[PDB]
Design a protein around this ligand. Structure first.
Ligand code: SF4
Ligand code: NI
Ligand code: NI
Lengths: 313, 708
């Protein structure tokens, strides 16, 4: 029999997030994920930890027990996460800027992000809310305040891609995430718009969408497969950027993880179900072609890091 | 003194002033004294842009005079004139740099002098997003303070960033113009050389946002010409130095407007004496468009208001339908024929109604003017009218062309709705949605019985007839490009639709003109042009360019396709197709089935099984998914003898298609009623019975060569 020699003409580009000795690089691979028997895998996929700019009230009880004395102050929370768990990066989610919730001015969130980014050495990812109009102004003020640290700004959708691209990559030398909703064509369109704006493939990453296991997950898997095959096999230049997936954003929000043992006695431990959901979603997206995953529970980060080390090592 | 000599003279004067002030800096501070601008990383931006060199000491500032000298070549050709304009810009920068060397703070408020890099990054984001529509560089002096204040505040009210040089700074102060960075009214300085401080803004915009390294002068000039929407308004008498500095603005792609008599250059140097039109002249000259924030209508306008049904007894007004004559039309017109934002209501308005219902003719004539506007784009925009009107609560409009009727309830009348608001909404939405193809829009609402019918006959019906004629007369050979749509790749990863004049998109909602309009309006959308070059087989419809485009779009899943055949590398199908065509070998022909048909077919499979086998973006020879307009096409199965092979078809589909099918088969030289030779489900459904019917009726398909 002949060994399967799958030669790809394409190659994923590298994007650097952060400054100093903690800065990480994403992308650089020329084969399918964990296909060390086919060629070169550029950089190991990264695992980041999610923190909030306000106290997490909807999080499960074990998570609030882990961060009991640090979740009140985002700076203290970030320092605790960097010290005790030492992740690849920290994703600071500005929940307080949500128009649906306790809407806050962009200045307050920018100040919180500036305080956080000057206390940690690991790369920081600043994630906004689901509102495009709010996101544009928020990221303007956040990128203005957090200048000189090479942060990553999430959710630069087509509605506000110009604003986040200008306030981000162009003005204050940051990186950005071009987000598209589970479509290869939409990912191509947003990448082409970013390139025509003046931002090359070395200055942004892609978010082809994320979903928890069992909730539109096959669409995420198929989108990741199609994007990876087009970028590598077909040498499509508009898709040769690393992909980042926020897993904890949707994985921890589902009923299979949020419900406590009191609500569903047969299901069992709530923390175990949350960790299992995070691990399953992260493993699937990592196998399908993502380059960085955002997780919430520290045990999930440990399990996913061990999984990556076992597969690559 | 002609234009070239005026510019050369000005550049020499700029060089003379630069040499004199540099000599003062050398004598007072020495060649080792530091040269810098407050808070910038680009040293002197113009010199850094042109040469890539950073100037740090006075001795290098003196050596920068050679750059000015090398840029002044007194030969009357356009390139030398632009280089001489750049010589003035470099000389002005050297003068401004020496000002900071000689005096610690050379600018006193209100003048700001040099603009630091953090300010550029602060206003750079609005420049990219269009929140700042443009940069108005106003220099000189207006005939009076109020004229300057009016023009400046006109630019300010439109969101433009205006910079001031010269006596207009004092005139604006006398005119009480509120100056500030947040107020977007920046006075640079009273000297002409202070105009370099807004020039470096455009230069550093290329350096910061364009990512262009220093010394790439052509790339920087290209960037400022395409990306920086700056223009110059030069008021008052213009010296040679002012003209040479304007040549520098022209060198950066910024048009220069003035109220003085000058040797005008089209699109670059323009004279506009009318101060009441200078703002509009500049916006047109710089291609600047100001977007409308909200629709000026008392009635609320939202997309959720579509589909509202409003009571009959509340119908204040009702136009169109079987009661009255109503029509709508969107027509391309030359710039002279349509004036921007002109809503004309002719005839009685809805106020005159004093009875519970209303009954009067309504005619909406919409004229759109633009550089890229085409007649083929008219049918698209007109369709959006249906939507533009339905988003207004209180009014419901449905119909096509002259078949439209509009019902207006009395709640909108109580709120203050009139017929002019129709024009306001139409103009605002035409400039929003089609702002890339429409420059000016004029809406006329006609209610008089006479003018409504006169304008319909003069304008409406000829447009409809020519549109129908173009739709019917377009063939593949006449056009030179096809189009490719991949909108169904969301569920069919390998499907690429090739739209030609005689092959409609199999979803049935995309045509060749629709694809062209979609490509024009949404260049990064799903519809992309496919040049029809490199033909291989004209009868089977094989093009090398088409194969290459299909291979690229489908991510290599599909290699070769044939447009006019179903047995040799057929086109793929996704799943939106209305009809399925399948090969019947025993009849030496083809049968068809629509999605509304539930019974079995002579092939032995229902519509569901055929859809499962055919769709999904897979090349299946012998089966095709297509729309209802493709059956009576001359390109239908052109690679297998044409549409004469159709032997079985559902009764309702046959009744729907019969007229056009008989026309095309008459082109084939068949009988007047060719559809009678086509078997129905009622006549016969079993294959043997179908073949018996075909033999009895003398179907042409039985007498052709074998299909496969
Ligand atoms: S079926 Fe219609 S929408 Fe789908 S790809 Fe073809 S032309 Fe586009
Ligand atoms: Ni389709
Ligand atoms: Ni389809």
């Amino acid at each position: 029999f002949k060994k399967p020699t799958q030669k790809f003409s394409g190659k994923i580009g590298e994007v650097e997030i952060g400054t100093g000795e903690k800065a990480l690089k994403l992308g650089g691979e020329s084969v399918l994920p964990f296909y060390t028997f086919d060629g070169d895998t550029g950089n190991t996929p990264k695992v980041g930890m999610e923190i909030l700019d306000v106290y997490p009230e909807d999080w499960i009880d074990p998570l609030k027990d882990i961060y009991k004395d640090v979740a009140k102050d985002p700076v203290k929370w970030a320092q605790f996460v960097e010290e005790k768990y030492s992740p690849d990066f920290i994703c600071l989610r500005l929940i307080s800027a949500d128009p649906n919730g306790t809407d806050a001015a962009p200045e307050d969130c920018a100040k919180t992000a500036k305080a956080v980014v000057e206390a940690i050495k690991t790369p920081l990812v600043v994630a906004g809310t689901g509102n495009h109009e709010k996101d544009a102004k928020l990221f303007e003020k956040v990128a203005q305040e957090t200048e000189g640290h090479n942060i990553l700004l999430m959710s630069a959708v087509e509605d506000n891609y110009k604003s986040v691209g200008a306030a981000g990559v162009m003005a204050y030398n940051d990186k950005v995430v071009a987000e598209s909703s589970v479509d290869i064509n939409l990912a191509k369109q947003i990448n082409i718009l970013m390139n025509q704006l003046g931002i090359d493939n070395t200055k942004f990453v892609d978010n082809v969408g994320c979903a928890a296991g069992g909730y539109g997950y096959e669409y995420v898997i198929s989108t990741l497969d199609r994007v990876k095959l087009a970028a590598l096999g077909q040498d499509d230049k508009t898709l040769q950027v690393p992909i980042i997936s926020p897993v904890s954003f949707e994985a921890c929000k589902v009923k299979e993880a949020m419900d406590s043992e009191e609500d569903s006695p047969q299901w069992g431990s709530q923390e175990d179900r949350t960790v299992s959901m995070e691990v399953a979603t992260a493993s699937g997206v990592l196998a399908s072609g993502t380059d960085a995953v955002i997780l919430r529970h520290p045990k999930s980060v440990e399990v996913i890091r061990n999984f990556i080390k076992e597969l690559l090592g | 003194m002609n234009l070239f000599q005026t510019v050369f003279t000005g550049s020499k004067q700029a060089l003379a002033a630069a040499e004199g002030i540099v000599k003062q800096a050398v004598d007072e501070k020495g060649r080792d004294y530091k040269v810098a601008f407050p808070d910038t990383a680009y040293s002197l931006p113009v010199i850094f842009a042109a040469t890539g060199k950073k100037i740090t000491n006075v001795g290098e500032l003196e050596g920068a005079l050679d750059i000015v000298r090398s840029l002044i070549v007194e030969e009357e050709m356009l390139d030398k004139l632009l280089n001489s304009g750049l010589a003035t810009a470099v000389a002005a920068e050297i003068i401004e740099a020496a000002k900071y060397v000689l005096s610690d703070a050379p600018y006193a408020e209100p003048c700001v002098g040099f603009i630091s890099d953090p300010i550029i990054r602060s206003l750079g984001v609005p420049l990219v997003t269009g929140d700042i529509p443009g940069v108005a560089v106003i220099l000189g002096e207006c005939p009076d303070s109020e004229t300057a204040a009016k023009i400046i505040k006109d630019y300010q009210s439109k969101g433009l960033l205006t910079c001031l040089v010269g006596k207009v700074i004092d005139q604006a102060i006398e005119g009480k113009v509120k100056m500030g960075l947040d107020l977007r009214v920046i006075p640079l300085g009273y000297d002409v050389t202070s105009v370099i401080h807004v020039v470096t803004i455009a230069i550093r915009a290329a350096l910061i946002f364009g990512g262009i390294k220093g010394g790439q002068l052509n790339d920087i000039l290209k960037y400022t010409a395409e990306r920086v929407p700056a223009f110059v308004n030069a008021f008052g008498p213009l010296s040679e130095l002012v003209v040479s500095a304007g040549a520098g603005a022209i060198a950066l792609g910024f048009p220069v407007l003035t109220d003085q008599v000058v040797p005008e250059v089209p699109t670059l140097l323009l004279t506009q004496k009318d101060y009441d039109k200078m703002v509009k002249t500049s916006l047109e000259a710089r291609n600047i468009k100001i977007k409308i924030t909200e629709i000026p209508i008392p009635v609320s306008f939202a997309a959720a208001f579509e589909g509202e049904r409003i009571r009959k007894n509340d119908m204040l007004a009702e136009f169109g339908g079987n009661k009255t004559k109503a029509w709508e039309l969107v027509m391309c017109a030359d710039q002279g024929e349509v004036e921007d934002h002109k809503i004309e209501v002719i005839g009685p308005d809805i106020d005159t109604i004093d009875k519970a219902p209303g009954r009067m003719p309504l005619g909406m004539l919409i004229k759109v003017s633009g550089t890229n506007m085409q007649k083929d784009f008219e049918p698209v925009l007109e369709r959006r009218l249906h939507y533009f009107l339905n988003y207004i609560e209180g009014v419901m409009h449905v119909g096509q062309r002259n078949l439209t009727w509009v019902r207006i309830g009395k709640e909108a009348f109580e709120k203050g709705f009139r017929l002019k608001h129709f024009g306001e909404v139409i103009y605002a939405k035409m400039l929003d949605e089609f702002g890339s193809v429409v420059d000016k829009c004029e809406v006329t609402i006609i209610t008089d019985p006479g003018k409504a019918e006169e304008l319909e006959g003069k304008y409406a019906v000829p447009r409809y007839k020519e549109r129908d004629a173009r739709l019917e007369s377009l063939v593949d050979e006449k056009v030179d490009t096809f189009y490719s749509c991949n909108l169904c790749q969301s569920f069919a990863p390998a499907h690429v639709c090739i739209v030609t004049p005689e092959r409609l998109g199999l979803c049935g909602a995309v045509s060749w003109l629709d694809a062209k309009a979609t490509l024009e309006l949404n260049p990064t959308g799903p519809c992309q042009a496919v040049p029809k070059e490199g033909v291989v087989d004209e009868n089977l419809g094989i093009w090398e360019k088409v194969n290459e485009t299909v291979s690229k779009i489908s991510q290599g899943a599909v290699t070769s396709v044939t447009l006019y055949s179903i047995l040799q590398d057929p086109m793929t199908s996704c799943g939106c197709f209305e009809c399925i065509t399948g090969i019947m070998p025993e009849a030496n022909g083809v049968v068809m089935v629509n999605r509304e048909f539930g019974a079995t077919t002579p092939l032995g499979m229902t519509f569901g099984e055929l859809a499962s086998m055919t769709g999904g973006g897979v090349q299946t020879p012998g089966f095709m998914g297509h729309g209802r307009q493709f059956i009576a096409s001359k390109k239908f199965m052109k690679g297998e003898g044409g549409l004469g092979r159709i032997v079985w078809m559902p009764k309702e589909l046959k009744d729907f298609v019969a007229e056009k099918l008989n026309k095309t088969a008459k082109e084939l030289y068949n009988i007047d009623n060719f559809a009678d030779m086509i078997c129905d489900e009622t006549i016969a459904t079993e294959s043997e019975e179908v073949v018996k019917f075909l033999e009895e009726k003398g179907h042409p398909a039985l007498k052709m060569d074998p299909i496969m």
